[PDB]
């Protein structure tokens, strides 16, 4: 359950050019992450509400679980695409440490 994005930002320094050329992509990702997180929080609330009314694996509960999964999946994908687009801006020599952090975090289940 680690925060893959935060892990990478904290663990892998960028050089001056790298920081500058990725600023716009970081801003766009922050906005996209917030939008999807709003959907995920709402979906979690709908699952909670469904179960509050009848705790059972019912059609309502099943559909609410799918909405949670879709929002979490959209966030996971958007996060990976952003990780990959950052990698493209890195100098080639700087990719091995970025990759190490990425791969290790994925292996532990971070998203």
What is the DSSP track for 50-108? HHHH--SS-HHHHHHHHHHHHHHHHHHHHHHHHHHHHHHHS-GGGHHHHHHHHHHHHHT
Please list, residue by residue across 1-26, b when 16 or more beta carbons sit within 10 angstroms of its beta carbon and e when fewer do. Answer: eeebbebbeeebebeeebeeebeeee
Q: Contact letters (x/-) for a copy of itself, 60-79, by CB under 8 A? A: -x---x---x---x--xx--
Q: Return the number of the residue (26 or 74) whose C-beta is nearest Ni ion.
A: 26
Q: Return the number of the residue (30 or 56) whose C-beta is nearest a copy of itself.
A: 56
Q: What is the largest CA-CA distance in the chain?
A: 56
Q: Return the number of the residue (16 or 103) whose C-beta is nearest a copy of itself.
A: 103
Out of 81, 91, 93, 97, name the contact with a copy of itself by CB under 8 A: 81
The binding site for a copy of itself (CB under 8 A) comprises: 1, 40-41, 44-45, 47-49, 51-52, 55-57, 61, 65, 69, 73, 76-77, 80-81, 83-84, 87, 99, 102-104, 106-109
């Amino acid at each position: 359950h680690g925060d893959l994005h935060e892990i990478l930002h904290e663990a892998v320094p960028l050089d001056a050019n790298e920081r500058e050329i990725l600023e716009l992509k970081e801003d766009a990702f922050a906005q996209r992450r917030r939008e999807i997180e709003t959907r995920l929080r709402a979906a979690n609330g709908k699952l909670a509400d469904a179960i509050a009314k009848n705790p059972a694996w019912s059609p309502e509960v099943e559909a609410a679980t799918q909405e949670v999964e879709r929002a979490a999946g959209d966030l996971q994908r958007a996060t990976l695409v952003h990780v990959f687009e950052c990698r493209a801006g890195l100098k080639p020599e700087h990719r091995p440490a970025y990759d190490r952090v990425l791969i290790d975090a994925l292996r532990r289940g971070s998203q």
